[PDB]
Amino acid sequence: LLPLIKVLVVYPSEICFHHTVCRFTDFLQNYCRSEVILEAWQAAAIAEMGPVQWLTTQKQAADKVVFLLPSQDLFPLAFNLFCSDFSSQTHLHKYLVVYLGGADLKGDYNALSVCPQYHLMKDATAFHTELLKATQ
Numbered sequence: 001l002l003p004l005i006k007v008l009v010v011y012p013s014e015i016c017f018h019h020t021v022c023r024f025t026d027f028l029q030n031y032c033r034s035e036v037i038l039e040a041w042q043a044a045a046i047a048e049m050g051p052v053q054w055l056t057t058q059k060q061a062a063d064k065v066v067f068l069l070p071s072q073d074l075f076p077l078a079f080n081l082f083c084s085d086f087s088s089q090t091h092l093h094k095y096l097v098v099y100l101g102g103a104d105l106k107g108d109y110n111a112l113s114v115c116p117q118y119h120l121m122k123d124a125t126a127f128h129t130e131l132l133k134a135t136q
Contacts, residue, residue, distance in 0.1 A: 003135040008037040008062035010055075012105055013073030020101030024068055024120075031124070032131050037062055039074050055081055063134045065095050067112055070103035083111045096130065 007028055011021045021040070028034045037058050039046065046054045055078050059065055065082065067075075086095050097112045100120040118127040 004033070004035055005063040005131055005134045006035040006037060006061060007032075007131070008058045008065045009068055010065065010075055010078040011039075011068040011072075012070070012075045012103060014103050014105075017070060017101065017103040020070070020103070021068065024098070024100055027120075027124075032128050034131060051077055052081070063094075064131060067095070067097045067109075067115070069097065069099050069109075069112070070101050070105060071099055072105065072107065076107055076109075079107075079109050079112075086111055086114045093130075096127075098127065 009021075009025065009028070011017065011024075021038075025036050025038060028036050042054070042058075049057065051074055055074065059082060065078075067079070082095060085091065088094070093116050095115045096118065097115045098118045098120055116130065118130075120127065
């Protein structure tokens, strides 16, 4: 296999956050050399699997799952489905939380605090290194 990791990116669907999602995916592909699994690029698979089965399938395919938050469509669904796995010892630190850009989230997602945290772009190097560890 290639030393190439796959990252599932879960993000709030608010229009005002869209530019941040694009910037983050560009950062993942180019700066972090990651294959990206993105709702916006898998409309047909989501339609045919339904949102729940799609999230569950992609979580299993992914090496890392990133919750992308500012400072919600699939976001609350992914949180609900994945949160019990956040501290799982089988997949150590599979779930990562990244803060970038601005937007007003409605919900509460307190269990995200049990995951590794990254504030971009200050933590870009630490985040990149975390992804790279996964090619080991």
